[PDB]
Amino acid sequence: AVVKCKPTSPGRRHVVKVVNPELHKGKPFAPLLEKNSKSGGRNNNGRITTRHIGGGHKQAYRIVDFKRNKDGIPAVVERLEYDPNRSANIALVLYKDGERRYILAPKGLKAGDQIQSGVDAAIKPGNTLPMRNIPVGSTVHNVEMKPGKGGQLARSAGTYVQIVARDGAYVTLRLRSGEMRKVEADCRATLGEVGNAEHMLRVLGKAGAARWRGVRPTVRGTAMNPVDHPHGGGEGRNFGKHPVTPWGVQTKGKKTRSNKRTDKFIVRRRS
Amino acid sequence: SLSTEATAKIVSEFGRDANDTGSTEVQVALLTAQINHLQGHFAEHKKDHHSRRGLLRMVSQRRKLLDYLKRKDVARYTQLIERLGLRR
Amino acid sequence: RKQVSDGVAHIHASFNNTIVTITDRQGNALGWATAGGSGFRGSRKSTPFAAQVAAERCADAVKEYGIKNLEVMVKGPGPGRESTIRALNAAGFRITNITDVTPIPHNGCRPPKKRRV
């Protein structure tokens, strides 16, 4: 539920919270946690590779089942939890044999529901079965690209992928970007949309809410010197040049894909 | 509307003769049953304004029947709203 | 030249022009002629004479394919709605079928607005 905050102060004037009362108000499941050390956007050479990253709140990593290999064994959904590592909420499920795991929470999933992986699984939101067993035209998420590798597509808070076709070993997908992509028909997929669809409805309100998320401020390029950026310089506000990267690459429109290995898997590009 | 068995179960519950079917408490409890049954309908279907007009018709009719019962005999009015759980 | 025995005459009779297309029973087109291509323009090409010479040209253009039997699909309202199949008989073709295949939606897409003339 989105809640507009009352303007008792600037910085609360424009804040929209996303309040979910179903999330667990306690500590997460400790065995499935591990350390997630921050980087600062710096590689093994110590240099900043990706900019604007730094700071933020400490985050523990939640081990999430994307491979979804417990076939045949049904599982009940114990509780829903918050994951700082990702936009979607996670679900703590309990298998019959006594194993607990974290999955991505689908849209309509709640505490007490039954999920089941495997080929003979039913078709309800939460089940994971190969797309040669999934009917054409359904919305799935957590989609594998390779069989047994683990789900890589449609993992963010409100996403889903439509299955538009199937030709033998392959199925054709309608990705969230609008791209039509071929995937082998033996790759697993999980039914339904991903949960937290109103994640994009939040408004941070203030700069600190981005510094909480580890997003350092972005200096725009024309506010620099010509040694710093191609856009820099000028006596006043001058920009008499085409918009490029900090490294002199055109940004407004120029394509950058140069992978001829996967061009056979792309049916149509996005528009 | 309300089903036939639930109607006859109310009629036999609050009717002096199990066939009066038009007494003031019978018409009130039949309205209160259909109202409380349609709380779930309009909680799910909030845009069913055409059915909601029939619901408000039931409420206004129950209120007129209650006000008649109040000035005709108060003790039946108290026993009625106490048994049906009516705030007024 | 490949001989073919049976054929289909598609007739696209609009208000402004009539298009005659001889094809096989598979839709692989054999030859075509239009009323505008029959030496007529503007007011002359929305006439039934323009269509019966577009049909005479199209039969001359499918002369070498050796067609003797022909069925006719007719689409659209126009003046060459009938005089075309008149000349297509008069070429010396035994007519077989005259089917009307004008597209009629079941209240589908919205037509354009009315001409305030």
């Binding site: - | - | 008989n89 007519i95 037509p111």
Partner: protein, 70 residues
Amino acid sequence: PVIKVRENEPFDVALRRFKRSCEKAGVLAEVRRREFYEKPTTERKRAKASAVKRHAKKLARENARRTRLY
């Protein structure tokens, strides 16, 4: 209007039957009706004037059947 020419049938016969069946199924007036959009005001107005034309002409024909002219 899929019309097969019967064996040893003239073409003007089969053509007149095809115009007959196309006028029966009502195609030309359908396309002329669907060439432009007609508002539901204009459609309700044309249907009301068609019914009033049907009706005042039925009463005028039956009343005019009675009285003479010379």
